[PDB]
Write a protein that holds these residues in place. Structure first.
Motif, mmCIF file in Angstrom:
data_model
loop_
_atom_site.group_PDB
_atom_site.id
_atom_site.type_symbol
_atom_site.label_atom_id
_atom_site.label_comp_id
_atom_site.label_asym_id
_atom_site.label_seq_id
_atom_site.Cartn_x
_atom_site.Cartn_y
_atom_site.Cartn_z
ATOM 1 N N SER A 136 -0.515 7.291 0.327
ATOM 2 C CA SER A 136 -2.062 7.830 -0.590
ATOM 3 C C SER A 136 -3.006 7.343 -0.068
ATOM 4 C CB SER A 136 -1.302 8.025 -1.778
ATOM 5 O OG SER A 136 -0.719 7.777 -2.755
ATOM 6 N N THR A 137 -2.807 5.847 -0.153
ATOM 7 C CA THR A 137 -3.422 4.818 -0.802
ATOM 8 C C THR A 137 -4.152 4.711 0.534
ATOM 9 O OG1 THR A 137 -2.543 3.360 -1.170
ATOM 10 C CG2 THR A 137 -3.854 3.617 -3.295
ATOM 11 N N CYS A 138 -3.059 4.022 1.527
ATOM 12 C CA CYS A 138 -2.835 3.840 3.221
ATOM 13 C C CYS A 138 -3.768 4.933 3.455
ATOM 14 C CB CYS A 138 -1.498 3.315 3.446
ATOM 15 S SG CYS A 138 -1.875 1.072 4.829
ATOM 16 N N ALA A 139 -3.540 6.664 3.201
ATOM 17 C CA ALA A 139 -3.746 7.409 4.235
ATOM 18 C C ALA A 139 -5.044 7.192 4.357
ATOM 19 C CB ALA A 139 -3.327 8.562 3.175
ATOM 20 N N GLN A 140 -5.913 6.354 2.957
ATOM 21 C CA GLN A 140 -7.451 6.833 2.956
ATOM 22 C C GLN A 140 -7.952 5.938 3.569
ATOM 23 O OE1 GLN A 140 -8.772 6.459 -1.324
ATOM 24 N NE2 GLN A 140 -8.997 8.868 -1.118
ATOM 25 N N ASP B 219 -0.957 -4.961 -1.266
ATOM 26 C CA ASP B 219 -2.361 -3.672 -1.950
ATOM 27 C C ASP B 219 -2.487 -5.147 -3.284
ATOM 28 O OD1 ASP B 219 -3.772 -0.932 -3.257
ATOM 29 O OD2 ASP B 219 -4.231 -2.598 -3.322
ATOM 30 N N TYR C 277 1.054 -1.184 0.481
ATOM 31 C CA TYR C 277 -0.379 0.175 -0.191
ATOM 32 C C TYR C 277 0.455 1.373 0.163
ATOM 33 C CZ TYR C 277 -4.286 -2.850 1.335
ATOM 34 O OH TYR C 277 -5.654 -3.510 1.074
ATOM 35 N N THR D 214 -17.680 5.364 6.477
ATOM 36 C CA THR D 214 -17.257 4.470 6.452
ATOM 37 C C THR D 214 -19.068 3.681 5.756
ATOM 38 O OG1 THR D 214 -15.550 3.549 7.282
ATOM 39 C CG2 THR D 214 -15.980 1.455 5.985
#
Length: 422
Positions: A11-15, A129, A8, A16
């Motif tokens: 930016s994606t892991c930073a991202q 991911d 990950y 209900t």
């Protein structure tokens, strides 16, 4: 050993949203057959628009698929024999990547370690991911097929009343667009259910897959079955009319049709371990490796020494030479429940009773079997002068090993042992 492109990203892991579910239609429901031509078209388009990063990514996923594929083939050899064996490391790799895409904390960290990637207990950027991996794995499938057919359909069979989560099923898209969720009774009877699954697969794929269920459970709520069909019409080679003798065993043999082609192939012989390789280009990047032992009395020993080990150092690149290669037409059909291969590695509880697969549906499902069924086909496809004095004929008329290799990714796509081609 960086696998950076698989983890990950910050930016994606930073991202209900509460996950919306659905129930598969009954397995008896009439279904459009699969168009394998459409599967190639898409795979090709997938390759043609690949960036440098995307090829680097495919390189990384190939290493692992290869490594796991070797570890699994080790298990498969021990399980058993008369037919031989065939394994497809990517198909097998993506099958587990799917289960990772449907698993939670305890199983999620485990499946990842099984897949080779290190995990940091606490870190999010050390987790795989799944979507990146599957697309990267779709890159690998694409590079194999740019004439060459590689169709892989997944049969996602569920117990009736079990709902699958829509987000999960979507995640598996890159792996293949030929995913089929279908509902059947998995607890009434295993043989009856077995014939329903076979009847469906035959219907849509067209491929007859001779699949004996090595028994089956009667409390399962989910089967996951990957079905690969490679077909290699090989340029230069053509069918020889009439059947020809293939040597199966010390007291038995059979006469089967052989294809044959002259060409500048790469051939060598390993002195260290007494065998010889024959390297045939299937395409601009694909290569069919054919290994035959000095004597067929230690094909078991060579197999352990070449496949089971991770190193493809035994693979070489010497100068081409005029060779008339003869080998049998291949209709290799293989099938193995991955659950049994994990049991052989003593990882029975990995996708067993306490396997946390909460992302797959409304209820944590009990996985029945995890099939991989192959149909590998080599056929005539449609050089120097016939009967050139410099033509040494390599002829495979007795047990031999095979492997398919793609150079750009470094992916071993198929490998196995041919003891009898019918």
């Amino acid at each position: 050993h960086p696998f950076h492109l698989l983890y990950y990203s910050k930016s994606t892991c930073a991202q209900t949203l509460p996950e919306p579910t659905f129930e598969p239609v009954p397995i008896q429901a009439k279904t459009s057959p699969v168009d394998e031509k459409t599967l190639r078209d898409k795979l090709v388009l997938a390759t043609e628009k690949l960036e440098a990063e995307d090829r680097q990514r495919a390189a990384q996923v190939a290493m692992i698929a290869n490594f796991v594929g070797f570890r699994m083939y080790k298990m498969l050899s021990e399980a058993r024999v008369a037919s031989g064996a065939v394994l497809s490391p990517p198909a097998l790799f993506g099958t587990l990547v799917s289960f990772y895409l449907g698993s939670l904390d305890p199983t999620a960290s485990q499946l990842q370690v099984l897949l080779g990637v290190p995990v940091k207990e606490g870190d999010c950027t050390s987790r795989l991911d799944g979507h990146k991996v599957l697309t990267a794995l779709q890159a690998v499938q694409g590079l194999l097929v740019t004439p060459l057919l590689q169709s892989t359909v997944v049969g996602l069979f569920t117990a009736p009343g079990l709902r699958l989560k829509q987000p999960f099923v979507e995640s598996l898209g890159p792996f293949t667009p030929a995913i089929f969720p279908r509902s059947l009774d998995l607890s009434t009877d295993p043989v009856l259910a077995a014939q329903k699954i076979n009847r469906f697969v035959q219907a849509v794929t067209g491929w007859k897959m001779n699949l004996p269920l090595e028994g089956v459970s009667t409390d399962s709520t989910l089967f996951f079955n990957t079905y690969v069909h490679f077909q290699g019409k090989m340029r230069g080679f053509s069918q020889l009319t009439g059947l020809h003798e293939f040597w199966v065993d010390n007291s038995t043999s059979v006469s089967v049709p052989m294809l044959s082609g002259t060409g500048n192939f790469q051939h060598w012989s390993d002195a260290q371990n007494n065998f010889s390789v024959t390297r045939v280009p299937l395409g601009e990047s694909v290569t069919l490796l054919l290994i035959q032992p000095q004597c067929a009395s230690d094909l078991d020993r060579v197999e352990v020494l070449v496949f089971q080990h991770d190193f493809l150092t035994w693979i070489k690149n010497p100068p081409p030479r005029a060779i008339r290669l003869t080998l049998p037409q291949l209709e290799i059909r293989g099938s193995y429940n991955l659950q049994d291969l994990l049991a052989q590695a003593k990882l029975s509880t990995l996708l067993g009773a306490e396997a946390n697969l909460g992302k797959m549906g409304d209820t944590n499902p009990r996985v029945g079997e995890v099939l991989n069924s192959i149909l590998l086909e080599l056929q005539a496809g449609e050089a120097q002068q016939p009967g050139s004095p410099e033509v040494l004929d390599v002829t495979l008329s007795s047990p031999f090993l095979f492997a398919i290799y793609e150079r750009d990714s470094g992916a071993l796509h198929f490998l196995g042992r041919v003891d009898n081609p019918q």
